[PDB]
Scaffold this motif. Structure first.
Motif, PDB file in Angstrom:
ATOM      1  N   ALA A  84     -44.249 -56.929  31.489  1.00  0.00           N
ATOM      2  CA  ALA A  84     -44.138 -56.159  32.727  1.00  0.00           C
ATOM      3  C   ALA A  84     -43.779 -57.054  33.905  1.00  0.00           C
ATOM      4  O   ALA A  84     -42.934 -56.680  34.731  1.00  0.00           O
ATOM      5  CB  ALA A  84     -45.439 -55.395  33.007  1.00  0.00           C
ATOM      6  N   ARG A  87     -40.130 -57.469  33.959  1.00  0.00           N
ATOM      7  CA  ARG A  87     -39.369 -56.297  34.372  1.00  0.00           C
ATOM      8  C   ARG A  87     -39.424 -56.091  35.877  1.00  0.00           C
ATOM      9  O   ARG A  87     -38.441 -55.631  36.480  1.00  0.00           O
ATOM     10  CB  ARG A  87     -39.890 -55.050  33.653  1.00  0.00           C
ATOM     11  N   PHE A  88     -40.554 -56.419  36.500  1.00  0.00           N
ATOM     12  CA  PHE A  88     -40.724 -56.188  37.927  1.00  0.00           C
ATOM     13  C   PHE A  88     -40.256 -57.357  38.781  1.00  0.00           C
ATOM     14  O   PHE A  88     -40.294 -57.265  40.011  1.00  0.00           O
ATOM     15  CB  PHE A  88     -42.193 -55.856  38.221  1.00  0.00           C
ATOM     16  N   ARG A 186     -60.248 -45.074  30.321  1.00  0.00           N
ATOM     17  CA  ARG A 186     -58.954 -44.556  29.873  1.00  0.00           C
ATOM     18  C   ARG A 186     -57.960 -45.679  29.607  1.00  0.00           C
ATOM     19  O   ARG A 186     -57.171 -45.596  28.659  1.00  0.00           O
ATOM     20  CB  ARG A 186     -58.377 -43.572  30.888  1.00  0.00           C
ATOM     21  N   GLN A 192     -52.172 -50.743  24.390  1.00  0.00           N
ATOM     22  CA  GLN A 192     -51.032 -50.707  23.484  1.00  0.00           C
ATOM     23  C   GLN A 192     -51.084 -51.776  22.401  1.00  0.00           C
ATOM     24  O   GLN A 192     -50.226 -51.764  21.513  1.00  0.00           O
ATOM     25  CB  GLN A 192     -49.722 -50.852  24.268  1.00  0.00           C
TER      26      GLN A 192
ATOM     27  N   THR B  94     -54.205 -36.809  30.763  1.00  0.00           N
ATOM     28  CA  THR B  94     -53.998 -36.117  32.027  1.00  0.00           C
ATOM     29  C   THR B  94     -52.514 -35.848  32.242  1.00  0.00           C
ATOM     30  O   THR B  94     -51.643 -36.416  31.577  1.00  0.00           O
ATOM     31  CB  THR B  94     -54.525 -36.913  33.229  1.00  0.00           C
ATOM     32  N   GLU B  97     -50.997 -39.202  33.106  1.00  0.00           N
ATOM     33  CA  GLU B  97     -50.917 -40.072  31.930  1.00  0.00           C
ATOM     34  C   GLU B  97     -49.775 -39.638  31.027  1.00  0.00           C
ATOM     35  O   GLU B  97     -49.000 -40.467  30.536  1.00  0.00           O
ATOM     36  CB  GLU B  97     -52.227 -40.054  31.129  1.00  0.00           C
ATOM     37  N   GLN B 100     -46.321 -40.441  32.659  1.00  0.00           N
ATOM     38  CA  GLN B 100     -45.967 -41.858  32.618  1.00  0.00           C
ATOM     39  C   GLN B 100     -45.637 -42.305  31.196  1.00  0.00           C
ATOM     40  O   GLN B 100     -44.724 -43.124  30.990  1.00  0.00           O
ATOM     41  CB  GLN B 100     -47.094 -42.705  33.214  1.00  0.00           C
ATOM     42  N   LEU B 105     -42.612 -44.846  27.765  1.00  0.00           N
ATOM     43  CA  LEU B 105     -42.622 -45.085  26.327  1.00  0.00           C
ATOM     44  C   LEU B 105     -41.735 -44.104  25.582  1.00  0.00           C
ATOM     45  O   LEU B 105     -41.554 -44.252  24.365  1.00  0.00           O
ATOM     46  CB  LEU B 105     -44.044 -44.998  25.762  1.00  0.00           C
ATOM     47  N   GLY B 189     -40.490 -50.161  35.539  1.00  0.00           N
ATOM     48  CA  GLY B 189     -41.398 -50.615  34.511  1.00  0.00           C
ATOM     49  C   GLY B 189     -41.212 -50.002  33.143  1.00  0.00           C
ATOM     50  O   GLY B 189     -42.029 -50.252  32.251  1.00  0.00           O
ATOM     51  N   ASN B 190     -40.161 -49.205  32.947  1.00  0.00           N
ATOM     52  CA  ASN B 190     -39.886 -48.616  31.643  1.00  0.00           C
ATOM     53  C   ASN B 190     -39.928 -49.691  30.556  1.00  0.00           C
ATOM     54  O   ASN B 190     -39.448 -50.809  30.748  1.00  0.00           O
ATOM     55  CB  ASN B 190     -38.520 -47.921  31.665  1.00  0.00           C
TER      56      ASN B 190
END
Ligand code: Y33
Ligand code: Y33
Ligand code: CA
Ligand code: CL
Ligand code: CL
Ligand code: CL
Ligand code: CL
Ligand code: CL
Ligand code: CL
Ligand code: CL
Lengths: 267, 265
Positions: A84, A87-88, A186, A192, B94, B97, B100, B105, B189-190
């Protein structure tokens, strides 16, 4: 007893895989359910990123941080396993919450180091452990060198019982507001990186969330929580298996998950 | 420069036995460049970005709540549903969630969970119409909307229609300032586009995009880029039935390079 079978089955795994397995399972108040090598030190590796996110959420909770604050960085922030952050990079920043979620759910090392930069480095991580009653866990270095896992080196270590109790404090012990607690739960469920480790050894109807780690010299770890038979648990698993392949270390931790399952369904 | 753009795309088409649809527009939807720009292509997973915009509009409007829990069972797991699988034991995801996960993804189950909530393909097509897109159409849920049967007009867009829809969502005021920024960060951010368009763009460009992979050789990438302090919206749809999956990635990356040459010119 069920605890004797648990010990015996973990010791079988240790012998046959040439491994050492540290486990602690505690209830929401931190009372010991069962364990193995509970007071042995293991390298934390990336598992500390879950307490790091808790540290950040406490600052948001207390009004000393904002989740949408932009943390600017350049190419020197990028280290190995920084998907990440890479990517940013062109955009020039990640927010506090973006970086924390990438650290927890992708194990992004650059995002972890970005947060460490903001909070005052490894000393500030250790200070947070002490604040929430963990006198054992210590962060000494940033990523990735904190994961070098030299045998006997006490830097960047925890014990299974210390870290299981830290997980319980964050999730069940009131360390975070109700909203922040639910959010970090959550994030752990949506991780992942854990599909092949502990949650692959737990029953499919258990609610499970966890944070993985992989260390040099054969370290493979998974810490988090599970909800089983209308009962909540915090768990920390740390393993060292220098001669196993990487896939075999995943299977080792999944096998520990099955041994835990057999214990819990017998309790 | 526009002739070079056309010539280099047609060389890729010829040598790869492919069709390449491209449209690049400025923030107001004015055409910068394109190729087969009004030919219909299957949108496949690229529609998940307009779906997320529709969700943000309903949250913006007070008709949806971003933290509303959407319950589901294992029936909602279809191919390529990694977040939906992880949240299955918990019993819900949610709204936010799910959105996103759909965008970053390309989670199919999360996409279908949201489609279940808005009333299905007819409502997503209604949203296209609301934002001035009279071309894009959703007819089916995932994964059958990606069947990409040759000549089928179901579940299609055109490069120009979708590029203008991207521009309308990011630059044309379809969403609040806050929601626009959030969906832009989601696209940056994909997690699925490292080998497609952004692989062919210069590394200082700020780029965000949404990919797609369909049956019968579809490979798509839509989104935005900021280059030399100017903002653009882009839609790329390609069809290459005889390439391998990796070669289709390389194809879209090569289109990114052709786009780069046009922009820098
Ligand atoms: C943390 O434990 C470790 C840090 C110290 O580097 C980190 C980030 C590496 C890994 S595994 C690594 C990341 N993903 C790669 C992968 O899955 N493969 C095989 C390509 C390897 C982890 C981890 O959480 O497992 N954390
Ligand atoms: C969307 O276009 C497509 C839907 C219709 O199934 C979807 C979800 C599939 C893919 S590619 C697929 C998911 N990840 C796999 C992968 O990359 N490897 C290497 C296994 C293949 C996409 C996509 O966006 O690329 N979308
Ligand atoms: Ca079901
Ligand atoms: Cl940005
Ligand atoms: Cl505390
Ligand atoms: Cl994933
Ligand atoms: Cl044209
Ligand atoms: Cl035309
Ligand atoms: Cl939950
Ligand atoms: Cl990733």
């Amino acid at each position: 007893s069920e605890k004797l079978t648990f010990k015996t089955d973990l010791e079988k795994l240790e012998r046959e895989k040439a491994a050492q397995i540290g486990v602690a399972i505690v209830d929401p108040q931190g009372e010991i359910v069962a364990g193995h090598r509970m007071a042995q030190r293991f390298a934390m590796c990336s598992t500390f990123k879950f307490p790091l996110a808790a540290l950040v959420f406490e600052r948001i909770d207390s009004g000393t941080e904002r989740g949408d604050r932009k943390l600017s960085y350049g190419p020197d922030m990028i280290v190995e396993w920084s998907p990440a952050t890479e990517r940013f990079l062109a955009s020039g920043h990640m927010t506090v919450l973006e970086a924390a979620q990438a650290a927890v759910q992708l194990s992004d090392n650059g995002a972890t180091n970005l947060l460490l930069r903001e909070i005052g480095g490894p000393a500030a991580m250790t200070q947070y452990f002490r604040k929430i009653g963990d006198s054992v866990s210590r962060l000494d270095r940033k990523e990735p060198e904190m994961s070098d896992n030299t045998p006997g080196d006490l830097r960047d270590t925890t014990t299974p019982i210390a870290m299981a109790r830290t997980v319980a404090k964050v999730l069940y012990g009131g360390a975070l507001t109700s909203t922040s607690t639910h959010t970090i739960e959550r994030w752990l469920i949506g991780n992942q990186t854990g599909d092949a480790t502990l949650r692959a050894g737990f029953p499919k109807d258990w609610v499970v969330g966890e944070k993985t780690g992989t260390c040099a010299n054969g370290g493979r770890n998974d810490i988090g929580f599970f909800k089983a038979q209308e009962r909540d648990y915090a768990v920390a698993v740390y393993t060292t298996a220098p001669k196993l392949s990487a896939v075999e270390r995943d299977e080792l931790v999944a096998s520990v998950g099955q041994v835990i399952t057999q214990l819990i369904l017998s309790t």
